[PDB]
């Protein structure tokens, strides 16, 4: 992972969302660059499984995040999963789970998906600023290579919003 800036980190989180679209489960991926320079990636896929992983004995989502690159390079990572009518939440800080998986709400059974919100640890990057032009260029190409998915990008730092969808 490149540490010139947090873009590559974001693209890896975006790729996990797009993989759900490519598999035919997600129809939309939303990316939001927050005012505090944190990035949030939301998809309407199946939702990162929250049931126990046999070998490890911990929620699959907890395990995936624990070993993820976002967790390693972010001072904070908050994940919300919509699955089976339930909204599960879990968070890590400085690389450590600071909030066990827990049901924070309910939702429609058909409303599934995952939200990954992370705050890069500025100490690991030459620059903590996200390169917007680079983020949008890669996203657009992503929309192109995954026909049918609607990709939106909301920039709350430069106050702009865009959406792209390539039907075929
Ligand atoms: C970083 O997590 C990624 C996902 O990222 C997002 N945003 O959804 C996505 O890329 C992909 O997500 C998958 C990949 C495979 C299945 C999949 O095979 C499912 N089918 C099941 O019936 C199932 C139900 C519960 C369960 O614990 C598992 C196995 C666990 C896995 C695949 C982590 C499978 C399912 O419900 O959801 C899935 C999901 C959401 O792979 C992950 C979990 C590594």
Curated annotation (Swiss-Prot):
Coiled coil: none annotated. ATP binds at residues 16, 43. Topoisomerase IV is essential for chromosome segregation; it is the principal protein responsible for decatenating newly replicated chromosomes. It relaxes supercoiled DNA. MukB stimulates the relaxation activity of topoisomerase IV and also has a modest effect on decatenation. Heterotetramer composed of ParC and ParE. Belongs to the type II topoisomerase family. ParE type 1 subfamily. This is DNA topoisomerase 4 subunit B. The gene is parE. The chain holds residues 27 to 217 of 630 of the full protein.
